[PDB]
Design a binder for this molecule. Sequence first.
Ligand SMILES: O=C(COc1ccccc1)Nc1cccc(F)c1
Length: 460
Amino acid sequence: QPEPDMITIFIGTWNMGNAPPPKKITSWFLSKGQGKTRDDSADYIPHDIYVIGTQEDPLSEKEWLEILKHSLQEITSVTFKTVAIHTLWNIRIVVLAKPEHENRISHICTDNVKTGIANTLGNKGAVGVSFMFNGTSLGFVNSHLTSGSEKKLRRNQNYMNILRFLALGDKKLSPFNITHRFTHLFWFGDLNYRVDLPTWEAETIIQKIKQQQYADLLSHDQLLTERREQKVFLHFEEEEITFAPTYRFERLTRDKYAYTKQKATGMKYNLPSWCDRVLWKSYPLVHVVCQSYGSTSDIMTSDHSPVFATFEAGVTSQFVSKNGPGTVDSQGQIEFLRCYATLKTKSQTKFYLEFHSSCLESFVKSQEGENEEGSEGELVVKFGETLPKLKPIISDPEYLLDQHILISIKSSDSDESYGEGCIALRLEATETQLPIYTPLTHHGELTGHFQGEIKLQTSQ
Ligand SMILES: O=C(COc1ccccc1)Nc1cccc(F)c1
C-alpha cells in the first residue's frame, strides 16, 4: 500500500453565535454554497484530514464530535478518527483523519493563546494543533480576534501575540515561531476584519451584495488592506473571495443582513463583512493548491455563515536508508557561497547563523559574520565562504531535494534571533552554484533578508 505524495485537507471556520447547529451541516463539509465550490462528482470522496474551527461554540466537545463524525460518516461512509480536540473558552479546534492515516500521524501537539489584558482578557484568543503526517509537518490555528470595525490595530496585535506565544511543533526549533515550524500552516477563524465603508452606506453595501458585485467591498476589506500594507499575515496566502460577506445575518434566514446598532451590539454597527477567513503559508516550492473557498447558504442558526476551504497539499514519506537516520550520508552536502544578511536593526553586535532542518542530525551554528555599513543606512552581515558545510543524514536526491533549511540570524551578545527565514533545497541543478534568497522576519514582522548561493551534492 504506497505512501501518498499528496493529501487533501478540509478547513472549516464557523462562529456558531452561541446557538446549537441545525440537524444537517453536510453542505459545509461538501464545500457547497457560494464562492469557489467543490464539484458534485467529488461528494463521496473523503478528504484525508478535516480541521474544524469554531468560535462562540456552545456545545461540549463530546456533543460536537458526535455531530462532526456522524456528518462525515453520512457523506463518505467512513468513520473518521479523532486526531486532536482543543478548546479555549468557546473557541475550539477538532482534527479528524481517515483511519488509514492513523499510523502516519504522530507528534500531536495542542496549545492556546489568550489575547488582551484585564478588560480584554477572557474571551478572545486562539487554539492550535500540529502533528507530523509521515515526513511533513502540519500546523493549524483557529483564532477569534477582537471585534469591532474600529479595532483593526487590536486584531493585528492579537495576531502577533498568537504567532509569538502559540507553542506548537518541534520545540528544538527554538528561534522559530509557528510561521516557520511547519511545511504547511493553515490559519483560520473569526478574524473579525470588517469592510471599512461609512455607516451611511449600509444599504448601498447590501445592494452590491444582492448584485453579487463584491469588488468595491473587497477593496475596503481591512484584512486585504492590512495585508497589502504588510501590517499582518506577512507571507501568508488567501484564495480570492467570491462569496458574500458571512456576517452579520439575521438568524434562521440568509435573506437579511442585521447591521444596525442595538443595545445587544454595544450600540455598534456591524456592516456586512468577511469576518470568517482561511489563510495559509507553506514552505517554498512545496505543492499547495486551494480547491475550494466559500460559504454555506443553508446553515442559518448563527449570525455568521460557515466558511470552507480545501487544499491539495504535498507530503513526503518517512525516509529510511542504510545510512541515515542514525548517521550522516557522506555522499550528501550543502554549501553556501557569497552569503549575506541585510538587517533593519540599529544595533552593532556581531551576528552568527543557525541552520535548522530535519535533514540534519542537529542544528549548526556558524562563525560570526563581518558587519559592513550598507549605502542606504542598513546593516549588511557578510559570511563570504565562511559558512559551515552541512551534512545531511540522507544523500538520496529523492529525499534531499524535498527538504528545507531554516535560518536564524542571532546576536552574539544576547543569542536572541533578529530574523528567521527558510530556503528550499528543490533546486534547478545539483553540483551547481545557484542563487538563494529568503526574507527574514522576527515576531512575524520583516527584519531583513538573506541571500547568497547554494551548492547541493546528492548521491546522484
Ligand atoms: O492519540 C491519538 C489521538 O486520539 C485522541 C485522544 C484524545 C483526544 C483526542 C484525540 N492518535 C491518532 C494518531 C493518528 C491519527 C489519529 F486519527 C489518531
